[PDB]
From a paper:
The protein crystals of the I105Y‐S130G enzyme diffracted to 1.3‐Å resolution with R work/R free factor values of 14% and 17%. Two enzyme molecules were modeled in a unit cell with multiple residues adopting two conformations. The double conformation of the 127–130 backbone loop, harboring the mutation site, could be modeled in both chains, whereas loops containing the residues 213–216 and 86–91 could be modeled in two orientations only in one of the chains (respectively). The side chains of numerous other residues were also modeled in double conformations, including Ser70 and Tyr105. The comparison between the crystal structures of BlaC wild‐type and I105Y‐S130G revealed two differences in the active site. First, the substitution of Ile to Tyr at position 105 considerably widens access to the active site, due to the orientation of the Tyr side chain, which resembles the conformation found in the TEM‐1 enzyme (Strynadka et al., 1992). Second, in the place of the missing Ser130 side chain in BlaC I105Y‐S130G, an acetate ion is present, suggesting possible anion‐assisted substrate hydrolysis. The overall configuration looks similar to that of the wild‐type, with the acetate molecule occupying the position of the missing Ser130 side chain and engaging in H‐bonding with Ser70, Lys73, and Lys234. Our kinetic data indicate that acetate ions could potentially also take over this role, as the 4‐fold increase in acetate concentration augmented I105Y‐S130G activity by 64%. The enzyme either exhibits dynamic behavior on a faster timescale (ns−1) or the observed double conformations are present only in the crystals, for example, induced by the moderately low pH in the crystallization buffer (pH 4.5).
Numbering used by the authors: 27 to 57, 59 to 83, 86 to 145, 145A, 145B, 145C, 145D, 146 to 238, ...
Write the structure that this text describes.
């Protein structure tokens, strides 16, 4: 009752909708708040996207050169903008997608996974293969960040995306080598310093992938480890849709939600 009341007060104070999921462990109950409501992925999908591309190919595929054109840049792409003439390798694209949320990098990874027409379906199908039957990606960048409130397109749920990230980082969806690549890129992003990371004490390890979008959308998905190595998965999702498409996202809402979780888990 206490935690639900705390999350409700966060919603009132930030004029926001908040979703939280933390899976159960052997000694802890699941934490859930709007955990089965749909929220836009925004860039959070880039973490399982990189997993999908790692999964389907040998490590040498990281060195495959991808060519692309200025026409492919229709989203914030601070890395891919600099390399149009030369192309980028798959590994470089993964790094860019995770560490900067480069949009074009994600689009090219989608096309590596499923071809130019089939990538969003292929990505969704990777989630299906991990037993996520809820989430859906229907558009690529930048449109996936812009669907109207209430539209199911390009959404996941805190519950669904937490269980996916759990399998990728704590489970064996990936072999150890590939899993370590994903976790290393996530451990090296910092877009997420002011989100879940800011709610956990410094002696807890945190790896994360953020997402930000229209309608004040701000998300973060993370795996955390206690100072003695005990892991938890934390998905926090939010929007401020009442302010319209240009509503300001509130990173501090996510930090506060994470602080609430950390207090329960400590």
């Amino acid at each position: 009752g206490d935690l639900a009341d705390r999350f409700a007060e966060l919603e009132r104070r930030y004029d926001a909708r908040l979703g939280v999921y933390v899976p159960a462990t052997g000694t802890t109950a699941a934490i859930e708040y709007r955990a089965d409501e749909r929220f836009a992925f925004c860039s959070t999908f880039k973490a399982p996207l990189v997993a999908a591309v790692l999964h389907q190919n040998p490590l040498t595929h990281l060195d495959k050169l991808i060519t692309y054109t200025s026409d492919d840049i229709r989203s914030y792409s601070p890395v891919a903008q600099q390399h149009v003439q030369t192309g980028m390798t798959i590994g470089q694209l993964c790094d860019a997608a995770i560490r900067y949320g480069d949009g074009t990098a994600a689009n090219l990874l989608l096309a590596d996974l499923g071809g130019p027409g089939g990538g969003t379906a292929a990505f969704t199908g990777y989630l299906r293969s991990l037993g996520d039957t809820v989430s859906r990606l229907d558009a690529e960048e930048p449109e996936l960040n812009r669907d109207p409130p209430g539209d199911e397109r390009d959404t996941t749920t805190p519950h669904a995306i937490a269980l996916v990230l759990q399998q990728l980082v704590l489970g064996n969806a990936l072999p150890p080598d590939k899993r370590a690549l994903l976790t290393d890129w996530m451990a090296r992003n910092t877009t997420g310093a002011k989100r879940i990371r800011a709610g956990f004490p410094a002696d807890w390890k945190v790896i994360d992938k953020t997402g930000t979008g229209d309608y004040g959308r701000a998300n973060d998905i993370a795996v955390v480890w206690s100072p003695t190595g005990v892991p938890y998965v934390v998905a926090v999702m939010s929007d401020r849709a009442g302010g319209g498409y240009d509503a300001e996202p509130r990173e501090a809402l996510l930090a506060e939600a994470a602080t609430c979780v950390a207090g329960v888990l400590a």
